[PDB]
Amino acid sequence: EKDVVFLIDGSEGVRSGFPLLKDFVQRVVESLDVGPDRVRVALVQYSDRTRPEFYLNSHMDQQGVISAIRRLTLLGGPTPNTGAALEFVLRNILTSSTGSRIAEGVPQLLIVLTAEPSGDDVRGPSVVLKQGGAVPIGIGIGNADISEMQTISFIPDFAVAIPTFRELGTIQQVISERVIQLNREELSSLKPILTPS
């Protein structure tokens, strides 16, 4: 059992790379055992606002999730306010009412993809998410800030920096491997790192 949420920068900085991002998300999902009693998948786009695209309880199989990803259109917007988006996910998407099994101790894995420095502070939100049971993996593309992605990530090791959307496919296996590593037992041995700025 895993709840896997993709939080995707949909600001204008991502417009040209968005089809490659959609491809990447599908590559990860295809590796997961998707179903209500196994892996649940959600996806939220964000810029200076958030837009849930589908929730952990929306689909019950691989076809449903993949079809939903394929149909995404870019949210748009000037900036990625990543900190606000992270808290929005914690408080609204990692919830029992929207299909999260957080209350039962199911891993809450949050894969964040962005291509620019955040338009807001991610430090405080990162603390709140780690204290609240989220396990984030920050994937910074291009101009994304390395420190920010490390800060967001449950521990810095989990963060990834890749120079272009073109290279995003080259990390799909290690992201899949991380999702596998992070079961309830492994997470039991892992503690998050909190040392803001």
Residue numbers in the entry: 1024 to 1220
Paper text:
The murine collagen VI α3N5 domain was crystallized and its structure solved by molecular replacement at 1.2 Å resolution. The crystal asymmetric unit contains one molecule of collagen VI α3N5 comprising residues E1024–P1219. For the remaining five residues, S1220–G1224, poorer electron density precluded unambiguous model building. The structure has a central six-stranded hydrophobic β sheet flanked on either side by three amphipathic α helices. Like most of the collagen VI VWA domains, the α3N5 domain does not contain a conserved MIDAS motif. The C-terminal extension comprises a short α helix approximately at right angles with helix α6 followed by an extended region that cradles between the α4 and α5 helices of the N5 domain. Closer examination of the structure in this region shows that the extension is linked to the core domain by a salt bridge formed by residue R1207 from the C-terminal extension and E1024 from the core domain. Furthermore, residues L1210 and L1213 pack into a hydrophobic patch (patch 1; Figure 3, dark blue) formed by the residues P1130, L1132, V1158, and L1205 from the core domain, and a second hydrophobic patch (patch 2; Figure 3, light blue) is created by the side chains F1177, I1178, and P1179 from the core domain, which is buried by P1215 and I1216 from the C-terminal extension. The last two residues of the extension showing unique electron density, residues L1217 and P1219, interact with a hydrophobic ladder created by the long hydrophobic portions of the side chains of residues R1146, V1150, and K1153 of the α4 helix (green). As a result, the N and C termini are at opposite sides of the domain, which allows the formation of beads-on-a-string assemblies of multiple domains.
Collagen VI is a ubiquitously expressed extracellular matrix protein that forms a structurally unique network of beaded microfilaments. All collagen VI chains consist of a relatively short triple-helical region as well as of N- and C-terminal globular structures that are largely made up of VWA domains. Von Willebrand factor A (VWA) domains consist of about 200 amino acid residues and act as interaction modules in many intra- and extracellular proteins, e.g., in copines, integrins, von Willebrand factor, complement factors B and C2, matrilins, and collagens. The collagen VI α3N5 domain structure is the first solved structure of a collagen VWA domain and differs from other VWA domains in having an extended C-terminal region comprising residues N1206–G1224.
